[PDB]
Design a binder for this molecule. Sequence first.
Ligand SMILES: C[NH+](C)c1cc(NC(=O)CNC(C)(C)C)c(O)c2c1C[C@H]1C[C@H]3[C@H]([NH+](C)C)C(O)=C(C(N)=O)C(=O)[C@@]3(O)C(O)=C1C2=O
Ligand SMILES: [Mg+2]
Ligand SMILES: [Mg+2]
Ligand SMILES: [Mg+2]
Ligand SMILES: [Mg+2]
Ligand SMILES: [Mg+2]
Ligand SMILES: [Mg+2]
Ligand SMILES: [Mg+2]
Ligand SMILES: [Mg+2]
Ligand SMILES: [Mg+2]
Ligand SMILES: [Mg+2]
Ligand SMILES: [Mg+2]
Ligand SMILES: [Mg+2]
Ligand SMILES: [Mg+2]
Ligand SMILES: [Mg+2]
Ligand SMILES: [Mg+2]
Ligand SMILES: [Mg+2]
Ligand SMILES: [Mg+2]
Ligand SMILES: [Mg+2]
Ligand SMILES: [Mg+2]
Ligand SMILES: [Mg+2]
Ligand SMILES: [Mg+2]
Ligand SMILES: [Mg+2]
Ligand SMILES: [Mg+2]
Ligand SMILES: [Mg+2]
Lengths: 100, 117, 100, 115, 210, 127, 83
Amino acid sequence: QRIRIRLKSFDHRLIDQSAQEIVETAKRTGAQVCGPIPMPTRIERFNVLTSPHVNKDARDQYEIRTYKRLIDIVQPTDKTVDALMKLDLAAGVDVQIALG
Amino acid sequence: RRRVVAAREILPDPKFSSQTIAKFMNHVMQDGKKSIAESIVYGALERVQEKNKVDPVEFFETTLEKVRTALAMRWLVDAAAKRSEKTMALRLAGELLDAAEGKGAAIKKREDVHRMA
Amino acid sequence: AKKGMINRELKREKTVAKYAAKRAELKATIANVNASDEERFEAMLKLQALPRNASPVRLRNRCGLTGRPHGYFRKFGLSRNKLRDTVMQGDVPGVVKASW
Amino acid sequence: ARIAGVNIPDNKHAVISLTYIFGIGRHTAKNILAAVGITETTKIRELDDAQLDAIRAEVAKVPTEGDLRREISMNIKRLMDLGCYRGLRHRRSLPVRGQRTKTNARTRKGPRKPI
Amino acid sequence: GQKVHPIGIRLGVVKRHNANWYANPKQYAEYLLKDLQVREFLTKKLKNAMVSNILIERPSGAAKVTISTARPGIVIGKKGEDIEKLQRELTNIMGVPAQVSINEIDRPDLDARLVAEAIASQLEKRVMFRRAMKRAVQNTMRAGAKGIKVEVSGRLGGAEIARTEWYREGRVPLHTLRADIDYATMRAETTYGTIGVKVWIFRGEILGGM
Amino acid sequence: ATNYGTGRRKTATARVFLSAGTGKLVINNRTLEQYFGRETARMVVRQPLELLEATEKYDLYITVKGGGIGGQAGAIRHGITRALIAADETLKPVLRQAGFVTRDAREVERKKLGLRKARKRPQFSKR
Amino acid sequence: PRSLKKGPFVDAHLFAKVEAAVASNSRKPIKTWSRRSMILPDFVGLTISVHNGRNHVPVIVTEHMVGHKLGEFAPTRTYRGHG
RNA sequence: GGGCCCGCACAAGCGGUGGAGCAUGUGGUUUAAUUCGAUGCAACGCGAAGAACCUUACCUGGCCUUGACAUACUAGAAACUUUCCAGAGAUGGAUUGGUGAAUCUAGAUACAGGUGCUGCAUGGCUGUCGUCAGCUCGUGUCGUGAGAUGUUGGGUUAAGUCCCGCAACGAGCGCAACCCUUUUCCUUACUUGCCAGCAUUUCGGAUGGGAACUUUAAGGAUACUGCCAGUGACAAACUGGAGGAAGGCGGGGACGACGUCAAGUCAUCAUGGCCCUUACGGCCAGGGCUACACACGUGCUACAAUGGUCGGUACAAAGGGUUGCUACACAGCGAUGUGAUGCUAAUCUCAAAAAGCCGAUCGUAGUCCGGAUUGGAGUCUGCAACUCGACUCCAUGAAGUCGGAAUCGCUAGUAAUCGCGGAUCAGAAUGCCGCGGUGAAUACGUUCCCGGG
RNA sequence: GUCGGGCUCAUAACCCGAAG
RNA sequence: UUUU
Ligand SMILES: C[NH+](C)c1cc(NC(=O)CNC(C)(C)C)c(O)c2c1C[C@H]1C[C@H]3[C@H]([NH+](C)C)C(O)=C(C(N)=O)C(=O)[C@@]3(O)C(O)=C1C2=O
Ligand SMILES: [Mg+2]
Ligand SMILES: [Mg+2]
Ligand SMILES: [Mg+2]
Ligand SMILES: [Mg+2]
Ligand SMILES: [Mg+2]
Ligand SMILES: [Mg+2]
Ligand SMILES: [Mg+2]
Ligand SMILES: [Mg+2]
Ligand SMILES: [Mg+2]
Ligand SMILES: [Mg+2]
Ligand SMILES: [Mg+2]
Ligand SMILES: [Mg+2]
Ligand SMILES: [Mg+2]
Ligand SMILES: [Mg+2]
Ligand SMILES: [Mg+2]
Ligand SMILES: [Mg+2]
Ligand SMILES: [Mg+2]
Ligand SMILES: [Mg+2]
Ligand SMILES: [Mg+2]
Ligand SMILES: [Mg+2]
Ligand SMILES: [Mg+2]
Ligand SMILES: [Mg+2]
Ligand SMILES: [Mg+2]
Ligand SMILES: [Mg+2]
């Protein structure tokens, strides 16, 4: 059975480290992995007036980026998914797992 | 600017590769509608060529001489407008023929400048 | 703002929370097509019989610290001023200064 | 040539010359010359009087210069006398649909005036 | 004037965030506000403690707060009745079973937060602000940081016209993004009103991004 | 006998496949005049091969997505000369002195905070 | 205007008053703060002392005045002239 | 006050504004009230990233007192949940299900409470000069000394940038670089995205498949006068031209020194102080901010043919979407309505890009220009569109035929033009912020105008 | 002469336009 | 050319 693991984060130094932390993890007691594909990132921006009273031109322009990554485990063993949920996922990275 | 700058080059027109007529269709051009300009000027040339058989790249250049560079192009394009006979490709082509035959509309439009001498 | 305003909006959205399912089923009954029309008039009349402050159209969104109603951001729940001063001291996830 | 009490232009397309009658635009003239069967391209100069009277019967089913102008001024009169908001606004030559008045009303209000 | 906040510009560059979680685009504000109250309360619960930073992690739908303080004693005291009940007191504010660890801050002199704490704690002691600022920069430059500016503004000790005074000893590169610069601002609530303390401290550039 | 070129101009990509054959062109499964009604876009689509005066020795199967008329015309010409001098390297001098080798860098400049149009600022007003 | 499939809008207080004063043919005008309730044929003959922000103006619901709201008959802005 | 230098400051060009219709902010006036703030540059589509009620702070009336909410004290009751009426509503009444912590009620004392005043008592934040190039220190030298030097001069430069001179030699903060983006290439990653080469083709990557290519997103390479010529003072620098995807700071953005303007803001917040406490506090329903003899600012749309209309056919990027976007079907002239469908999204949808190209049509006119304005009939949001919404259809078809004195923006993918998106938001953008399409002309020069070192 | 605009950080002058 |  297939295991599609999708990673989400607000930072990429976290999502990539978690992905290459779990890929090796599986590949140690199994195989048939399709690596962390990088999926296009969402980037939503904001304008914030910075003064208290009246200055339309003075604005801090901010961003927030959500990065997403794909990971395929095609036919893992029965000694793999146990060690998959047996791994502590950091903060700032969310992982959602779906059996195909 | 304050010290010195150079001029800019333009890619010669893809039909005849003559830089002057390309600079000229960059004068009828307005608001970025280069297609309108190309149609207008190529039509003017294809009208002045079939009657009064002359090589048209040779032709526009042997007729602008009696108009004088950029100033001649402005005088042409505006003297080409105040005719209201048919589509603009025609009141540029008739104005080129009027400049060749030595008329007063563009051949002697700048005569008021030589009159001032 | 003046605490009357924050209590007023706690008031209004508390009401909307109270009469929520009622307003929902009434709105549903109206748009019915397989229902009698005496009911499709009773439902109208009963819906507009509610408190003015029952329908969330009357609410307005305010800052999670100050309560300032102009310059709101639904992504954050705060208005502009405290948002700026929190993004800068490093208290929000993902947000940086944008440039491209 | 002479339709609904106006001399529509003659040497011009039919759909465009039919709109000179106060009460007909492009949609209504297209409806007319569709219900009679004369294409819009036909210039009036080339019309036999076998079709002019049919299209006259057509415009006769349309409110045109006289009656249209009449009932127009009559509704405004109902408004003026009923003393409602828009009748008041009609008495003063001000924008009535709810347009701004601090400035930008020189079409209802007329040109600019000095002190 | 009109300078950008020091930490805010080197946030995606060389500084980390004081909040590390993830939240879907319609459940983000819930989490952020649950976080803001927790910070707001901890900064009073541990005010006479020596906290310099609060870091809130929401790992996979959990709650874990790490406070980097100087005296773990005042926030613990007797071991077994506060930090395991302070987690109870936080869980009520985050809404998620929380955990609170201790970051023993060695070199308790590199924090603009704590330098501002001591400076304002002296200002509200009615001390001469010049000796205060300068004693603090003595305290901090000696301890190994390579540059310090201290800024103090507003009706200083009770005159009727406001004025601003700073002291800069060492190196403080602000336009250099790879510069590790701690910066902290506080308000000394004197009986004459408000004095603003700002404190920049530098320690040497960051070489290698993150 | 199959050579590839990737040609970017503004937001266009113009995957070009050049092969030795007749003079035949298909622009995204469409003929040269079926695609660019602006027959100057075809003129510069036929700039490089005609400069080498071949125009009959190669077939071109091309696929371009992104941009507009002029952007895609310049992108296709770009990808064509890339495929061209990937075939016969010694060609690069000539295609260099007419300008067909250089990836034109100018992209649209972004709007600014406080500006009408990225260098257009509001009409200044005094008193 | 209101959507014809939602029907006309009338408030409950004013309409209860109108239905209670039609069964009495009262001559006392109906004092209301609505300004937004539409005029029904029910209303003809009656006179409504409708608000105008400051005062109450009673308007006598005449025949051509159906399809209007109450408030349409009380100008809320005082304007006589500028000079 | 001189001198030099610089900068769309002027010049040359391109396009606007001042003219006309409307949108919007201000002044005034008006008014019950038209809430307050912001006044040269640096206020005037400004706080407001969205006034129908709400927001709301103002006016009109109608109501409340430990007060809508903090804690400190006393007593009976689990929080609750129904249902009706008077009422414009607040507000009250009247009824059902539940049986030491809590959540209202009752009371009293401090107190709460004010968007009230002072930004000239303050902080915290911002404009502005101005991304302007400056601001200093250590030693060493000169001046009894304060001080000076350095940091000046010839050049140069975007630049206290660099060189050469020189009683200065160094150093720091500013400059630049480190940061993000865009341009070329490489390594990885191959799905939801891709289709080069095979075949299956229901002609659609669709479907097997392939991991090439485009793309996607992580880690890197490249550019540095490096190379040659020339001018130059064994100089910096500058002019090339070769190469190169890119050549000299390749393009943009973020970052805004020391200080000035008692610049802006007690109406974000906080705060010292002063004032109010049956009201300047709290709660309501209607109005109002939407007024209109007029005056200004900033925009949107046009006056036509390089155009209007109608038909046919292309090509974007970037964003949004579960209370949301909705394939498709049915109804309508349409706005939309009903069923119906996938989607928490590189998968489904918004979504059609427009200007462009092809064909006809109009033939230089107040017109098939232009849409103001008005009458008529609707749709949707909403509890309600009168005051005071947007959109849709029919009719209606003003002004306006390139605009005075004057004046503004712009040096390249820019001006000019053509459309798309979002934030705010139930609905309400010509405004703001972004996105891409097409795509110029000119710069002789510093005498002047304007701001600075 | 007046009134509206232009001009200046602010004034007249001056320029324009209008009414008379 | 009038005022700081
Ligand atoms: C000298 N007067 C008039 C004055 C007094 C006060 N303060 C007070 O009223 C008294 N302050 C107390 C409460 C007694 C401590 C004042 O507070 C002020 C001022 C002056 C104004 C001048 C303003 C001026 N105007 C023309 C716009 C201006 O242009 C400037 C400027 N160009 O910088 C100003 O400084 C000004 O805006 C201003 O700030 C003033 C005052 O602050
Ligand atoms: Mg307050
Ligand atoms: Mg609202
Ligand atoms: Mg007509
Ligand atoms: Mg810099
Ligand atoms: Mg861009
Ligand atoms: Mg603006
Ligand atoms: Mg002006
Ligand atoms: Mg000029
Ligand atoms: Mg003020
Ligand atoms: Mg009491
Ligand atoms: Mg001030
Ligand atoms: Mg201040
Ligand atoms: Mg210099
Ligand atoms: Mg330097
Ligand atoms: Mg002041
Ligand atoms: Mg105060
Ligand atoms: Mg005030
Ligand atoms: Mg109200
Ligand atoms: Mg307003
Ligand atoms: Mg028209
Ligand atoms: Mg006229
Ligand atoms: Mg420039
Ligand atoms: Mg553009
Ligand atoms: Mg000067």
